[PDB]
Structure 1
């Protein structure tokens, strides 16, 4: 652990991290619907749909072990309500033991197969029922068809969206902040879904942990304070760790990554976490995350309209995703696999010491790079991290980065883009996208654009001249730093931040973890 440099004594010297969240205090019980539903304290919510019939009437088909509640929820009483996706209603009644209970439903539309996006709409409606209501318990009755993954995704999203980050609140803490202590789930074939519960809780926190890092402002989350948090995480998970400082970075000749950080008051820190199975290692993997704790753009300052320089604390989202994945892996402990978690962390600032547009810098594999734009710094840091990664001698290298703003014009805010040099690896990323329900789409590395990276003086240009297809050109650049290893690149510049909700998504954590686990 290094000392975080301060300008004034009021500068914070660590990232506040909440490990023990109220979500971890929730006891989850899973019951089979065949046994009938018991309705007592708290809130009991039925998830209902009506196949084919858009905005069709609500029907409760589950057995309810209470004559009063059963009478209330009979068809004739429910037909005035419809199943419009996201619709919710609260019911109030007395049960067979003369106790007042709260019941209700969330409409799940008229399609039996709910997409990952429509399921998020269902959960958000459910969360609005949790907010502003001091409840001790919530019960959920699944009257829709969900597979194991979508069930887990439901729980993960519930936990994530229910949670409220108050680390930076001082005088504006919510006085009515109270969480349930109990969560009941009624679902058919309950014994097959039980295994998903703790997995979801693990995936929730891995995702929530990343979110905390991303949301943490750059005066809290800087290269030293972020690497320090990585150390603390490794210590709690019994992961091996190594933080490389400028001296060793110099010895390794990482000129590209070092030049990006030259302008910052915070020394570069290269994070290297390792998980190894106790069993014989049958596959080795490196996960590489972009780790810019703040990206001012450098001398190519973000001063253009729509550049959102105030969002630039998000620029270590790739690193956050990787560290979030480290939590999940170190907790679930997969067998026969060795995983490296890597991030070349730095800050891209303006200074007398900054690297300049036009500078020629040498990467750790000896390639000279001409810098055409100081704000294209991510691919420079990744270049050295990718060289470092391949020297580990692994089977797959997967990187994840808020790399290019062009992603918002190509895939937008919902789907991440994946590029690569190996088809089998890309299919596996796409497969893990399905089973994690973190949407990713395969995008091409167009070789014809490679020629536009031909530098007159250096071995290669940092950015293209023609093109404008930045996401693809950046992928071309990165590919030049991976010689003979299966490699994939996940651009999350578009999906990292939830603009509507004004919070990080913790995107990529579940995706990467599913990738590690399912092979």
Structure 2
């Protein structure tokens, strides 16, 4: 660990992290729905739809072993409510044994197959009830059709949205039990503890992102990665400035010049006990705060107050490290990499127009100091290819233009290898973290031709900045299958005012399958 510098003694010197969450204490049981439902304790919620009849009435089919609840659930009562996606109702009542129970439903629409976005709305409705609930148990009865991956997604999302981050603070009570009624329960049981792992990986990423830039800086973040590595028995190595200078990472070092925090390059490694048959490098953009540099984020809508999230790529990679270190896949070697620094305004900062030299010898003309992500990634990519891996995948809050292309739901993936892109797309499908394949259009490459340097950092005209940024990155991968995931648009949940932890499950599914 390294000592993080302070301006005043009241400046924090570590990131507060919660490992043991109330979610981990929840005992989960899955029952088959064919046998009927037991309603004796806590809150019971039926997931109900009505195919064909848009906003049609609620109808409960499951038999329950309680006379009081059976009467409440009768068709004449339930038809007073409708299945409009996200709509919920729940009532408190006494059961046959005169114990207080709560019974309700969440509408799941009129389409039999729920998208991940549909399922998310269902969960949010459920969580709203939970945040006003003090009962010890929740039972969810699936009277809809979900596959194994979507059911795991249901649990992951439920766990993630339920949990509230109160680290920076100075009603309800977390349930101790979760019951689930679903068809062929036995096949869904193995998803439960996988969901719990995917949850924390995602929530851990969220904690790092949500942590403000005075708490989460290059030194405190690399410190956290070390502590994580030690807990998971991963090989770890933090490269300091002197080492970085020796490796000649001029692009990455240039970005951090104006920061009071020294650059820290995070390198964690998972190695399988058995034969190593595939080597992967995961690269996360790790800007702990993006002020923009001398190209300061002062334009309307530039949202400088959001830019603690510019290390979301790093967070996703570290979150994946947790999942991989916990699930311990076989026959694989994975490197978790992040060139961490802070982009600030100072007498010491790099300037627009500056020509800097990357670790592969390429000279780069800086057109915009706020395009700093690709500079750090450039040296990180050179570092990764030197490891001699089969796949290189980077993930980064790289370009604001993603907001105008795919939006806030789908991340974009670019690459030099169709097979690798396909694996990512497949991983997106099974993780239910949506990604869309975007092209690297070679005709735009000429725009990066610098008059004085080997290459330009940005275009002056093209405006297709996400593609141009990909073209720049491609110049630092010489002979390895490489993919690039731009999560600038999808990383932050603007409506809920919190991170998503996007990427963790996607990257984990990628290495596992």
TM-score range, shorter chain: over 0.9
Deviates more, 1:210-219 or 1:88-97: 88-97
Match of 1:111 in 2: 111
3-state SS, counterpart of residue 349 of structure 2:
coil
Query: Does the CA contact (< 8 Å) of 1:33 and 1:63 recur in 2?
Result: no
Whole-angstrom CA distance in 2 between matches of 1:5 and 1:179: 38
Maintained 8 Å contact 2:16/2:167: yes
Out of 27-36 and 270-279, give the one that drifted further: 27-36
Separation (CA, whole Å) in 2 of partners of 1:94 and 1:4: 57
> 1:95-152 CA deviation, whole Å, 9 max, x = no partner?
2223232100001000000010010000000011111221211110000000000000
Bigger mean CA deviation after superposition, 52-61 or 208-217: 52-61
Contact in 2 for aligned 1:363/1:369 (Cα 8 Å): yes
Deviation >6 Å, runs of 4+: none
Q: Structure 1 residues 129 and 177, CA, compared in 2 at 3 Å: closer, same or farther?
A: closer
Matched residue pairs, number? 513
> Which residues of structure 1 form unaligned runs of 5+?
171-175
Q: Deviations over 1:481-510 (max 9, x none)?
A: 000000000000000001111100000000
RMSD over aligned Cα atoms? 0.8
Q: Secondary structure at the match of 2:44?
A: strand
1:417-473 alpha-carbon deviations (Å, 9 max, x no partner):
000000010011010101001010000001001001000110000001220111000
Q: Cα offset for 1:177? A: 4.9
Give the Cα separation in 2 of the matches to 1:95 and 1:495. Answer: 45
Structure 1 distance, partners of 2:462, 2:334, is 36
Q: CA deviation at 1:92?
A: 3.1
Q: In 2 relative to 1, CA 327–250 (structure 1 residues): closer, same or farther, beyond 3 Å?
A: same
Q: Indicate the residue corresponding to 2:28 in structure 1.
A: 28
Q: TM-score with structure 2 length normalisation? A: 0.99
Tell me the TM-score normalised to structure 1 length: 0.98
CA shift digits 1:258-309 (9 cap, x unpaired): 0000110100000000001001011000000000000111111111111011
Q: 2:373 & 2:96 partners in 1: Cα distance?
A: 63
Matched, 1:364 2:353: no
The answer (yes or no) to whether the contact 2:56–2:84 under 8 Å persists in 1 is yes
What SS does the corresponding residue of 1:350 show, helix, strand or coil?
A: coil
Query: SS at the partner of 2:267?
Result: strand
Tell me how far apart the structure 2 counterparts of residues 381 and 12 of structure 1 sit (CA, whole Å): 26
Unaligned runs of 5+ residues in structure 2 are none
Other-structure match for 2:62: 62
2:289 touches 2:309 (CA, 8 Å); kept in 1?
yes
Residue aligned with 1:194, SS:
helix
Shift of 1:40: 1.5
Q: Spell out, residue by residue over 1:6-39, the C-alpha distance to the aligned partner (whole angstroms, 9 max, x if none).
A: 1111110000000001111111111111221110
What is the aligned partner in structure 2 of residue 53 from structure 1? 53
State the partner residue of 2:79: 79
**Is contact 2:42–2:100 with CA below 8 Å preserved after alignment?**
no
Following superposition, the deviation at residue 389 of structure 1 comes to 0.3
**Equivalents in 2 of 1:291, 1:70: separation in Å?**
55
Q: CA deviation at 1:91?
A: 2.4
Alpha-carbon distance in 1 for matches of 2:167, 2:76? 48
Contact 2:130 2:172 in 1 (8 A): no
Partner of 1:71, secondary structure, is: helix
**Cα offset, 1:80, TM superposition:** 1.6
